[PDB]
C-alpha cells in the first residue's frame, strides 16, 4: 500500500461483530484503541456506517475473503493492511480467538486492535519488547504506548 494516509480525518466501519462480547463493549474497545493513536497524531477517527470507510473492520475465521487465512485458536490473532484504497487500511480479527478484556481468559480486543490500527496507519514492528508494535502479543493493564511507538507514528504524521 502507501506509507501513510494522505488525509487526516480517517473513517472506520465495523462491518460485523463477534458474539464473544456485547456490541457496545466491542465498539468501545475499538474507540479506545483509536483514541490511543489520535491523541498523539493530527489524525481523527470517525465511525461511519458505510462501505466508503477508510478502515473496514471485520471478524472472521480461516479463509475469510482476502487470501490471507487465519489459523484457528491462538497464533495469528488479527491482521491489518497498510494505508491505501480498497482493502488497504482494513483490519480483521480472528474470531477463532476468544475476545475479552484480556485480564482473565482470552485476548484483549483493545490491545490487539491498538496494534492492528498501528499497522493500518503504516507502522511496522518495533524492536522494543515493551512497545505496542512489538511482534509478540502481551497483556498489560498499563499504558500501551512506548516512546518508540510514538516516534514511529510521529515520523509518519508529525
Ligand atoms: C501491549 O503490547 C502488545 C504488543 C503486541 C501485540 C500484538 C501482536 C501481534 C498481534 S497479531 C499477530 C500475531 C502473531 C503473528 C502475526 C500477527 C499479525 C501479522 C499477520 C501477518 O503479517 O500475516 C500482526 O503482527 O499484526 C496482535 C497484537 C499486542 C500488545
Ligand atoms: Ca480500506
Ligand atoms: Ca488465530
Ligand atoms: Ca470468538
Ligand atoms: Zn483478512
Ligand atoms: Zn503486528
Swiss-Prot record:
Zn(2+) 1 binds at residues 64, 66, 79, 92. Ca(2+) 1 binds at residues 20, 95, 97. It is found in: Secreted, Extracellular space, Extracellular matrix. Processing of the precursor yields different active forms of 64, 67 and 82 kDa. Sequentially processing by MMP3 yields the 82 kDa matrix metalloproteinase-9. Matrix metalloproteinase that plays an essential role in local proteolysis of the extracellular matrix and in leukocyte migration. Could play a role in bone osteoclastic resorption. Cleaves KiSS1 at a Gly-|-Leu bond. Cleaves NINJ1 to generate the Secreted ninjurin-1 form. Cleaves type IV and type V collagen into large C-terminal three quarter fragments and shorter N-terminal one quarter fragments. Degrades fibronectin but not laminin or Pz-peptide. Exists as monomer or homodimer; disulfide-linked. Also exists as heterodimer with LCN2. Macrophages and transformed cell lines produce only the monomeric form. Interacts with ECM1. This is Matrix metalloproteinase-9. It comes from Homo sapiens (Human). The chain holds residues 112 to 444 of 707 of the full protein.
